[PDB]
From a paper:
To adapt to fluctuating protein folding loads in the endoplasmic reticulum (ER), the Hsp70 chaperone [name] is reversibly modified with adenosine monophosphate (AMP) by the ER-resident Fic-enzyme [name]/[name]. The heat shock protein (Hsp) 70 family member [name] is a major chaperone within the ER that assists protein folding and degradation as well as contributes to UPR regulation. The [name] of [name] is catalyzed by an ER-resident AMP transferase [name] (also known as [name]), the only human representative of the family of filamentation induced by cyclic-AMP (Fic) enzymes. [name] contains two N-terminal [name] motifs and a transmembrane helix that anchors the enzyme to the ER membrane.
Since the complex crystallized in the presence of AMP-[name] (a β-γ non-hydrolyzable ATP analog that prevents intrinsic ATP hydrolysis of [name]), [name] is present in its ATP-bound conformation. The SBD and NBD of [name] are docked to each other and the conserved hydrophobic linker is tucked into the NBD of [name]. The complex structure reveals two distinct interfaces. At the center of the interface between the [name] motif and the NBD, the linker residues V415BiP and L417BiP are engaged in a hydrophobic cluster together with V241BiP and L128FICD. The hydrophobic cluster is enveloped by various residues engaged in polar interactions, such as the ionic bond of E105FICD and R197BiP and a distinct triple lysine hub consisting of K121FICD-D238BiP, K124FICD-E217BiP, K124FICD-D238BiP, and K127FICD-E243BiP.
Residue numbers in the entry:
A (entry chain B): 102 to 433
B (entry chain A): 26 to 548
The structure:
Amino acid sequence: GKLEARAALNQALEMKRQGKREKAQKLFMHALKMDPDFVDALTEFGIFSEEDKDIIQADYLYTRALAISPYHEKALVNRDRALPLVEEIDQRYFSIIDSKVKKVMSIPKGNSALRRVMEETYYHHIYHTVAIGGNTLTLSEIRHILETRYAVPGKSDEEQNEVIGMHAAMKYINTTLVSRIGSVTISDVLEIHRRVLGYVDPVEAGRFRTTQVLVGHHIPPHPQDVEKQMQEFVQWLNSEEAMNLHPVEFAALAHYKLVYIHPFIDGNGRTSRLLMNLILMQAGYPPITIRKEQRSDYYHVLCAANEGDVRPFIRFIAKCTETTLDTLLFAT
Amino acid sequence: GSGTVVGIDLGTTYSCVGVFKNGRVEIIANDQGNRITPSYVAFTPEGERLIGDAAKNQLTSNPENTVFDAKRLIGRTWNDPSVQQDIKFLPFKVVEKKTKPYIQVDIGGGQTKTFAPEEISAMVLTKMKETAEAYLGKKVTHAVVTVPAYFNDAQRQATKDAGTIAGLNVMRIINEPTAAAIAYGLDKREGEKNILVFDLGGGAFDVSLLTIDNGVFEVVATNGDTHLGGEDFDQRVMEHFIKLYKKKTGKDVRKDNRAVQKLRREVEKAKRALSSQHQARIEIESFYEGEDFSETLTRAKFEELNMDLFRSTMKPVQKVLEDSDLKKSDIDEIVLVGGSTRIPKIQQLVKEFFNGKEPSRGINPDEAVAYGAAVQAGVLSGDQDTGDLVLLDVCPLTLGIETVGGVMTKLIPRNTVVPTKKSQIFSTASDNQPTVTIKVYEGERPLTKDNHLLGTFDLTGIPPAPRGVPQIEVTFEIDVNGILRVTAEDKGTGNKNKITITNDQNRLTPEEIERMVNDAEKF
Ligand SMILES: Nc1ncnc2c1ncn2[C@@H]1O[C@H](COP(=O)(O)OP(=O)(O)NP(=O)(O)O)[C@@H](O)[C@H]1O
Ligand SMILES: *CC(=O)NCCc1cn([C@@H]2O[C@H](COP(*)(=O)O)[C@@H](O)[C@H]2O)nn1
Ligand SMILES: [Mg+2]
Ligand SMILES: [Mg+2]
């Protein structure tokens, strides 16, 4: 009941005054469980979170209270104070990424440690990018198909056609588009999807969808507007506004925007993740890995971006970038 | 509006109603001036329905049409080993209906009606409702009803159904030790204290460890037995004198309901005396075939017949300390509640468990649960003299899913603060599979064969797709009442398809409950 929520909020504030923050945390949580729309509890919980310097959580609670009460004064004031702090937190984390990416590229490429890790990381990227969608092929089975050109008995042809399609897509990007000085065109995007879905679906591979499909509760553009939306997308690519963006933020936005457009029947996620790393590789960054285990988190930040806030998605891509940089620096 | 919300202790053997009104909590006495009413229902051969003191006072002369201890049958199935074992020990007829134990009695005139266990408890709650209505001078529509802390999902839902049939909006089912803790902290504002509540009554047993703090009640760990109490203590004394009477006279009074129930009443009376005396006499004239019964029950003999049960009450105290990662020195006060805690041997075992620490005295152990239910009832009604009472109660049982191999995969662990939500992705095993079946279990054992089955749910409406492709997110929410609600939703992209869930719990449907409500309104 909602009457019980006010009591839990009063005790939460009472326990905060006495320094019993762990108990106040539970009482704040219980208040919001009794009334998820408790404007006072949402606002006071944000103040509580901001005291622990968790400004990202505080801004979420403030915004959640303002969606219910758009003119609530205490939430409006505290959200304004928290907004520069959130930007500083995101800029600080980007600076930590730049400290690690300049350290991994400082060593010469001829090092046997880097080249050995980069070689086995390639099959890791093929493994994680298909297994995050449901592919059951193991890493050793994936390496077996690509290196020996022998099929694996007991494994479906579709899962093997995905791996081989991804291998042809990465080899095309790594040897034609990464070091290319020119801009990115629509024909490049169609050529990557032709490689990705070429062996799974030779009919739809390399062409946009002509029908309006749905992506959950997310509505992609109409089919007659896809090509216009794609032309405006690649126009946002190679743009001075995008170059001024941080490489991680630029590669993350291009990832989501391509998923947002959803130009193909299938292979939209695989194509967007390839475009993400092509951008990172062009900026000197190593290709990052969105691990198979992060499937649910990958869906959550995508769903959060489809519902107004793409910053949790950018932070997710950033955390994936730091994770692969830490494993690269682990070789030394 | 909600009117005046009352607090009702719906016990296995004894019920009690109280209200928080005019800045204080009061226990309300019934029409016979008694602060506590037995959970008894009887039907006279003349056609008169009796509830409470009158129903119990005629048990000996009408044992077949006298219903009691229905709390040991609510929320259970016909194949329950506890149910089948209790049939041999209850003088009234219990038949199977919809795989559930139903009570069949004679209501006079040769006509026999069959009542669900929820309908029997509804009559007891009705007597408690009318007791408060006669005191307040107005109709009572809302209430807070107590349940044992270790009640499972089916037992909790059945108790709420009993209140629905009694014409009550059960605003909250409150666990007994939590209610007892409220009664302990009503007059105290002493900061953070660790309390161990020992609830041993007529039919159930609960042990909870709570962290109290000026109106905040935080249950850290709970554990007990819903089928362990004073009724089992009386049966040990009953079975002792039945064998003794067979040894002296050669008669087997086992099949005589009138003789056995006479012995049960006098055994329960002698047990109460042995809490303050060392010897008690049991006299029953015309006990069997005109032969009188005359024996003496010693406290030492009563403790001897129940020493295994008395010692077993220490295991839940050990489990709540292990789960809470607390030692005996961390407990600030010990609170004994329930009628069976008046037994000197019980108080001795609890005291010796805690190295001689004296329990906290002051609250009547018979009424402590009823006091806290009334205080919580006053809180839910918005009473100007209740305070910011907040209950952070937990679930007693671990909710899990039966995976391949009969493995108990934990979803919501025990002692998890309620309300709580838990979501998990489920998929299909075969191509174009339209239905996925999930089996939920309650218990702490590693294999689901040893745990209690909560229910089997089926997720229908899945569109044709290859195996592993569907992504159904099933959410398991335990509400503030401790009752589970299962929902499913598609999470894959494309057309969001509705996932309908059906279960085999075979509980009382709303159409069956409305029939029982109208059958109760005809009185
Ligand atoms: N002085 C006493 N000595 C021993 N046993 C007693 C005494 N007074 C009451 N009892 C027993 O205590 C029980 C009633 O206590 P109570 O706490 O109301 O249990 P309850 O009503 O059945 N609630 P519950 O058992 O949790 O469902 C009965 O079994 C009584 O026989
Ligand atoms: C809450 C919410 O927005 N959920 C949807 C999240 C989401 C997922 N995608 C991408 O779409 C493809 C699959 O699309 P289906 O219509 O076939 C997949 O790559 C997935 O990552 N976009 N938004
Ligand atoms: Mg009782
Ligand atoms: Mg009890």
